[PDB]
Ligand binder design. Structure first.
Ligand SMILES: Nc1ncnc2c1ncn2[C@@H]1O[C@H](COP(=O)(O)OP(=O)(O)CP(=O)(O)O)[C@@H](O)[C@H]1O
Ligand SMILES: Nc1ncnc2c1ncn2[C@@H]1O[C@H](COP(=O)(O)OP(=O)(O)CP(=O)(O)O)[C@@H](O)[C@H]1O
Ligand SMILES: Nc1ncnc2c1ncn2[C@@H]1O[C@H](COP(=O)(O)OP(=O)(O)CP(=O)(O)O)[C@@H](O)[C@H]1O
Lengths: 429, 429, 429
């Protein structure tokens, strides 16, 4: 792939050489086309301490080496070409970088002829530019899910993005108004994990950019409104052979194989530590274990459990040959999430983990009359669990410890904030 | 070069005959094409006392003789042609004028077959017209460096200026959102010092003019916001023979030659006086030795030290064959800065100056763990050092004493200003 | 002295056991009469780190032992008795406490039969409660000094305090409107240095308190208004034998003795370090070396010089038998100031210091016509001089080092404040 030739052919005047840091932030440099060949070979230089990579201002620059197969001409601005990149440091891929970490786990699975494919359901809200309320003041009803009126009221922005995804070859197939007022979701086809991760990273940027062009704002925040359903990132998962067979497809219950159940056994066994990574913010813990919403259900997990075609659990089995992890939220890192899921799932397979008993009940109601482990209740406990989880931490490489350091500091920063609630309830102590 | 003929050919209707004064202020006269031939030969008359040149209202006019090879048709207004000029007084170049002062030092070095080449990293903020806040209220995060979102939010202005630089033949190659919210930087190829100095003077005017056309404002202020990273002007330096060999390239530590280390010895040796010139404002001293910023590092020097590929010192060695002086800020005079740097480095070469021990540590966390000289803490102390430095004062000629005079007065003016901080902390003494 | 008996007899219901810290802050504990006997013997406990004493939160409490001879029943609230105290730490007088530091230097002088007596002219402004403007909007003229109208407009507050001083036995004898609009001064009789120091500490508290009772606010700030004269604390000084002979009285010039001139020699010799103590704030340096005021003179020192009956110098000789040190401002510590002056003076006497030639000229218009040493121009330079001054630093003991540490930090805090002036003069650099 000759980026310089493509630039001339396609009318690309600038490239964004982009990488995702440990907090999911999209870091990028805008390089004119005249300079792209040098960047493609040598990488684009960044001072790593200035991003969430856990480095030092005394370190040599990281070099972000773009993956030319990731190229996307911005559909709303085709003269700019976006590239995803691997962060290198001292002549090697830098293990603290999320994309590099995912590729490491992918390579170990590939080594055993197991290829992760996943799809993501990236819920988002459309809100006012100042972020104080949803973008549509006429979207107010108690059960607004799939509301035809409010959906069509945002047809222009939804249709524009959906059409871009058609053009990009992602195979979009549905657009919904989701369960909270102001909340939407646009699905597209699953793919090899690295393809989906790059798409996931690009998708969020695309949605935010387009919303902004329409005088709106998009947020993937886990719990932007106290009494409304939160933003999930439900992740659909299966493992394939290079020959093209889905290893999860089987003759067991619900059409799953023993490999599928073992992979699930790993998700279940490592759930506490996995929460730290797929629920990576303080705010994440207001979506999990949340009080019932105005629409009648939170639709998020409270417990470390799985069901059949049942949306009240940590894991749902929607159909034969795949698992839906409902645990992640909209803040989950597009690269770290698949990486930690894969690490856990692999350990499950390797150890033939038992996921325990499928629960065919509504956990929100018929959950108090059963023994089920509760998810970590806050970021601190989740991070504590990640640190104690040798498989996850080891699986993610140096990314895990750096991630844990940052999230601990975020939690501490959160603790120090004085809230109006404490004042009202404690001033008269 | 026939400016009159060029005017007819290129459709230039007015020329800005411009020179830079001791404070870096761009002084210009707008002359209609009909009058250019006269100005080219004879120079444009200015009352020198009215600019920062340390003259008298009783003096005969200075004559600014334009350098025809410096011609730039304003890319945003091609009917106007900008020219850099040498200030002449009483029939000869005026030593108090920055460009003249630079050319004098360059000629002494050239006499020894040593040709300074440099590049500049001119950081700037984009702010509201009233100067009170950055231009992008959505650019708020603690670590905004290389933020893809904020970068693309200013694509139009950044892309316009980058494309001008392509057309101008400067070889631009990267555009970044820098470490402070609202802060950016656009790099271009190094060149002979005089070429880069003229480009540097033009660039700042270009950035400000274009920002203003977009309803924005650009500032090169060293420290426009108390808790954010400031505007550096990191200067990359090498010395070349007329035959085309880089004298700094060598077999020693980090691919540097003894000549490079001696030049560096001169920078370290004259650092206190050099600080007055490359940090020429009261505000400069709020960038140097600053308390840690929200982003986690100031990225500016505190000490007279150097490192390898390490951004925590006064000098960084980014790669074989050059030095990065991190000392200067956005207020540094585009002509006086290379001038003082060269005077210092030349002396280091002539005396075989020892730069001392390279420090492979983060000076921000380890400044105490070592004996290092601190930079002058304020403009008064810097100017005192400059006045005491015979090599610098001698190297800059009469420019040095005039500059010191002005900067002493600025510091005295600053001292006389009553601050809100003082009233808060002293009213109850 | 039986404070419990005095309490019963005078109707004192509470005592303020007070000590002055290194920044001059009055620290006090309010003790009901039933507990005074205990406090008088054992001392009143305080956590020393919580005041400006350079201690540790891990230190045992300091004990402030009240001087029963210092008792003052607050004239505006006689049921409360104020006591000055010596801070003890671990069973010994605490050398970092100003009053203890002063008593140490007095002891050394007394051991040589030399007893310091001094009087203080404590200028202050009466300002609005919010501190933004003077209290009398009708006080506006260019030369308001001794203005009959404005003086009588504040007759009630001035007369109340003056009558208080009469009753306290301080021998008040004049009340003036001073040279700045809104500025006043009330003089009282000199006394033994420790008496005057205690009186000085109480006086500031009394003026502030009574002003507040009248809906006004008093400030001793050195330079509260940019273009107005500042608050001096002119200190009148003589040295006496126990027998009662003024050692400064003599047959030399102006009725001064060789002892007086040697003491003066100490003041001149140690002036740079002395400045740090008697001009202890950043703001202090806006009073010293200030641009001429609306009234035609600053009345503060610019240079290390002395004159006769002449108010343009650092030292004035008002009459035979005493020296006026015009250096100190309204922020000067009531204890540290006489302590530092005495240490310098004693050294002068010890070494027979030569004060140099008396200058019988106006230094404001004659600064150029003579070779004179300028005073430290800012707090940082003053503190540097203090640390370099062995006699002074040694004479003040550990208080000097603690003071210097604090004042360095204040200067650094000041440096970090972005001023509107910088913005205006630097945004377009
Ligand atoms: N075998 C498989 N492995 C991984 N992902 C798969 C998969 N089969 C389908 N997917 C993906 O999972 C995501 C969701 O698929 P689908 O929409 O059919 O499930 P679901 O109907 O439970 C979602 P919703 O409730 O929003 O309608 C899609 O991106 C889809 O491509
Ligand atoms: N031998 C040399 N002498 C002087 N300047 C040189 C040079 N080689 C490169 N430069 C210049 O130095 C400037 C910076 O170059 P470069 O971008 O490679 O360094 P760097 O990566 O440390 C900058 P940043 O941190 O912003 O990415 C450019 O103007 C470049 O042209
Ligand atoms: N021998 C001495 N030693 C120390 N202080 C003395 C002194 N004799 C007088 N003083 C004191 O000096 C202070 C000022 O004295 P005085 O008012 O006479 O001088 P001055 O007239 O220069 C003051 P102003 O300019 O405000 O009118 C008073 O506190 C006074 O008691």
């Amino acid at each position: 792939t000759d980026l310089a030739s493509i630039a001339r052919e396609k009318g690309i005047e600038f490239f964004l050489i982009s990488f995702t840091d440990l907090l999911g932030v999209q870091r990028a440099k805008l390089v004119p086309a005249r300079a792209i060949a040098d960047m493609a070979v040598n990488g684009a230089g960044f001072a790593g301490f200035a991003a969430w990579l856990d480095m030092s201002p005394a370190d040599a620059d990281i070099l972000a080496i773009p993956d030319p197969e990731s190229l996307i001409q911005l559909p709303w601005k085709p003269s700019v070409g976006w590239l995803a990149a691997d962060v290198h440091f001292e002549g090697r891929p830098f293990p603290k970088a999320p994309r590099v970490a995912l590729k490491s786990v992918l390579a170990r699975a590939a080594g055993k002829d197991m290829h992760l494919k996943h799809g993501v359901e990236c819920e988002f809200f459309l809100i006012q530019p100042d972020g104080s309320a949803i973008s549509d003041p006429a979207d107010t009803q108690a059960k607004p899910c799939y509301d035809q009126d409010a959906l069509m009221r945002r047809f222009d922005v939804i249709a524009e993005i959906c059409s871009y995804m058609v053009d990009l070859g992602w195979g979009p197939y549905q657009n919904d108004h989701e369960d909270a007022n102001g909340q939407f979701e646009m699905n597209w086809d699953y793919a090899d994990a690295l393809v989906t991760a790059d798409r996931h990273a690009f998708f969020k940027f695309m949605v935010k950019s387009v919303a902004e062009r329409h005088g709106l704002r998009a947020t993937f925040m886990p719990k932007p409104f106290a009494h409304l359903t939160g933003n999930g990132c439900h992740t659909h998962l299966s493992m394939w052979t290079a020959a093209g067979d889905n290893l999860f497809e089987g003759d067991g219950e619900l059409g799953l194989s023993p490999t599928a159940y073992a992979f699930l056994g790993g998700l279940i066994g490592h759930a506490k530590g996995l929460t730290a990574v797929v629920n990576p913010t303080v705010n994440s813990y207001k979506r999990l274990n949340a009080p019932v919403t105005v629409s009648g259900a939170t639709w998020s997990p409270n417990t470390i459990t799985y069901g059949g075609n049942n949306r009240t659990h940590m894991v749902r089995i929607p159909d034969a040959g795949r698992l839906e992890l409902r645990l992640p939220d909209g803040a989950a890192n597009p690269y770290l999430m698949p990486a930690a899921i894969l690490a856990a799932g692999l350990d499950g397979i390797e150890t033939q983990a038992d996921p325990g008993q499928r629960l065919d009940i509504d956990m929100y109601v018929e959950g108090h009359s059963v023994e089920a482990e509760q998810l970590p209740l806050n970021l601190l406990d989740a991070v504590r669990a990640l640190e104690a989880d040798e498989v996850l931490a080891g699986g993610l490489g140096a990314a895990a410890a750096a991630f844990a350091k940052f999230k601990r500091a975020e939690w501490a920063d959160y603790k120090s904030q004085l809230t109006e609630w404490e004042r009202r309830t404690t001033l008269d102590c």
